[PDB]
């Protein structure tokens, strides 16, 4: 065949999100969520410290 495409698994877009956090803030009430939902809203909120 002719490799006119590459099948990749989880694609990587162009633009992304990059966050800088002042590292001294940190609400102390700790929010822990369902183990499963901690997997969906897993990275999202984590990146979003």
């Amino acid at each position: 065949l002719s490799d006119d495409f590459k099948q990749i698994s989880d694609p990587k877009g162009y633009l992304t999100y990059s966050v800088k956090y002042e590292d001294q803030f940190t609400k102390k009430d700790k929010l822990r969520a369902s183990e499963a939902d901690d997997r969906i809203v897993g990275p999202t909120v984590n990146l979003f410290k």
Binding site: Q7, I8, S9, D10, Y17, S34, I40, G42
Partner: protein, 50 residues
């Protein structure tokens, strides 16, 4: 001006196809109501951020 050129060029040729990969399915009870409407079943296992 040129960083802009090769890049337009890269987008110009991103000949890559996609394959569903290690998706998972949680069903209601497992996860929250709020997130749940958002989810329509079998969300990709390696999610993103949003």
């Amino acid at each position: 001006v040129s960083g802009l050129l090769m890049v337009l060029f890269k987008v110009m040729t991103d000949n890559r196809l996609v394959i569903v990969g290690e998706t998972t399915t949680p069903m209601s009870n497992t996860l929250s109501t709020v997130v749940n409407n958002v989810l329509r079943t079998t969300y990709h296992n390696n999610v993103g951020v949003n």
